[PDB]
Structure formats: C-alpha cells, structure tokens
C-alpha cells in the first residue's frame, strides 16, 4: 500500500483535480481517491524536445500537465497536442499494457506524476 504526500500549492491541487475530472477514465473516482491522487503527485520537469514516454514502453507513472505543451504521436503522425490540465499515461497502468503513443515536449514542460504503486494503491 505504497503512498506518500508531497506538499504543493493550492493552484496545483486544483489543476490536478480539473485534469482528473476532465478525463473519462478517471472522472468517476470517489472524492477520497481524487484527494489521494492529488497528495501522491510530485513535480517533474522535462526540457524541450524530450520524450516523456515512448510508444511500446511499459507504464511507470501517470502524468498531469502543468506548464508547456507536449505532442502525442503514433506511427509518426501527430495525434494531438496537450497543454496544462491534461492527463496521460493512465491507460498503460489501468490495463497493464505498453504505451500506445509517444509523448514528447514541444517546449520546456512541467508536470505532476504519480508512481504506479501509489496509483495502484488508490485504485484498489
């Protein structure tokens, strides 16, 4: 039952909650689960032109964008761009499978990540 609270700003808590409630796979979580996810999220930064996750890789974190923009690609096609308040990486963890798409930064990016063990603890 791995878990750890990371102290963060009120704006960041609101951003994580908005991202959860905006995603069809996550938006029906109980309030207690939403808060546990908020608490277990920790900050990560990736410089511009950096792959966050690559298609075909095993999942390790669930990500919520905080600042900057990422491009999601598959088979060399831009699927979309993702800015603040968007979740990604949850499917690989929820369905214990590899990443369907690559996510690469277009500019310097800040995001919130939750370790798969903590996400698994909360979903249980």
Numbering used by the authors: 79 to 202
List passages from the publication reporting this PDB structure:
Cyclic GMP-dependent protein kinases (PKGs) are key mediators of the nitric oxide/cyclic guanosine monophosphate (cGMP) signaling pathway that regulates biological functions as diverse as smooth muscle contraction, cardiac function, and axon guidance. PKGs belong to the AGC family of protein kinases and have N-terminal regulatory (R) and C-terminal catalytic (C) domains. The R-domain comprises a leucine zipper (LZ) domain, a linker region with an auto-inhibitory (AI) sequence, and two cyclic nucleotide-binding (CNB-A and -B) domains. By analogy to PKA, the PKG R-domain is thought to bind via its AI sequence to the C-domain active site to form an auto-inhibited R:C state; binding of cGMP to the R-domain destabilizes this state and allows active kinase to phosphorylate downstream substrates.
A mutation that causes familial Thoracic Aortic Aneurysms and Dissections (TAAD) maps to this arginine of CNB-A (PKG Iα residue 177), and the mutation to glutamine constitutively activates the enzyme. Mutation R177Q in PKG Iα is associated with TAAD and constitutively activates the holoenzyme despite weakening cGMP affinity for CNB-A more than 105-fold. We also present a high-resolution structure of the CNB-A domain with the TAAD mutation, which reveals a closed cGMP pocket. The similarity of this mutant domain to wildtype cGMP-bound structures and its differences with the open pocket in the AI enzyme explain the constitutive activation of the holoenzyme in TAAD. Since the RQ mutation does not alter folding or prevent adoption of the closed conformation, we propose that the CNB-A sequence is biased to adopt the closed state. Because the PBC of the RQ CNB-A domain makes intermonomer crystal contacts, it is possible that these contacts help stabilize the closed state. We conclude that neither crystal contacts nor interactions with cGMP are needed to drive either the wildtype or mutant domain to the closed state, supporting our hypothesis that PBC-A is biased toward the closed state. Chemical shifts of apo R192Q NH resonances are more similar to those of the cGMP-bound wildtype than to the apo wildtype, consistent with the mutation inducing a similar conformational change as cGMP binding to wildtype. We therefore conclude that the RQ mutation causes constitutive kinase activation by allowing CNB-A to adopt a closed PBC-A similar to that of cGMP-bound wildtype without binding cGMP. The activating effect of the CNB-A RQ mutation reflects destabilization of the auto-inhibited state we describe here.
